[PDB]
Amino acid sequence: MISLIAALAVDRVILPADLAWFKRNTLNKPVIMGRHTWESIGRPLPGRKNIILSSQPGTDDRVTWVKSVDEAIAACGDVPEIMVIGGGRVFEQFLPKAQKLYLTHIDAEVEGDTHFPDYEPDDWESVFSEFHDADAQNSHSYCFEILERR
Numbered sequence: 001m002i003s004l005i006a007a008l009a010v011d012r013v014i015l016p017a018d019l020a021w022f023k024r025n026t027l028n029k030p031v032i033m034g035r036h037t038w039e040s041i042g043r044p045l046p047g048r049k050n051i052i053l054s055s056q057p058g059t060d061d062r063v064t065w066v067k068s069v070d071e072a073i074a075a076c077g078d079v080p081e082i083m084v085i086g087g088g089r090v091f092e093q094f095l096p097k098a099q100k101l102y103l104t105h106i107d108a109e110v111e112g113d114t115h116f117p118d119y120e121p122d123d124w125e126s127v128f129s130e131f132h133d134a135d136a137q138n139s140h141s142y143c144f145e146i147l148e149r150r
């Protein structure tokens with residue numbers, strides 16, 4: 001089953017507490033990302049099969065390069081759950097096939113260009129929500145949400 005995971009600020013623009021959330025829900029799962037996202041981490045996410053979706057030939061043999069959504073899905077094989085970690089245009093392509101959304105709602109206004117897709121709230125069931133206030137380590141309030149396609 002295909003899952004999307006992302007941290008969303010004001011206007012769905014894409015807090016150390018999110019890193020443990022991301023790491024826990026992606027460990028030992030294949031991760032599908034865009035090229036811009038791949039250029040950001042610089043090296044593959046440890047303990048996870050890294051798949052990059054790009055129309056251009058690959059330039060790093062440490063990860064798995066694919067040129068379409070269906071090729072990215074096939075590259076994962078038969079696994080319990082596939083995680084898509086962005087960015088925005090990659091999220092848009094995998095949203096119609098996604099059955100789970102791992103959203104971290106961060107009450108923060110940041111300057112951004114890219115946004116998480118405008119998913120239809122009517123089509124998603126909130127199966128998990130966990131609200132946290134800001135503290136000495138997290139400068140904003142944040143809510144860990146998991147939604148399942150209806």
Ligand SMILES: [Mn+2]
Pocket residue numbers: none
């Ligand atoms: Mn080769």
Ligand SMILES: [Mn+2]
Pocket residue numbers: 107108109139140141
């Ligand atoms: Mn805030």
Ligand SMILES: [Mn+2]
Pocket residue numbers: 109
């Ligand atoms: Mn303002």
Ligand SMILES: [Mn+2]
Pocket residue numbers: 133
């Ligand atoms: Mn409190």
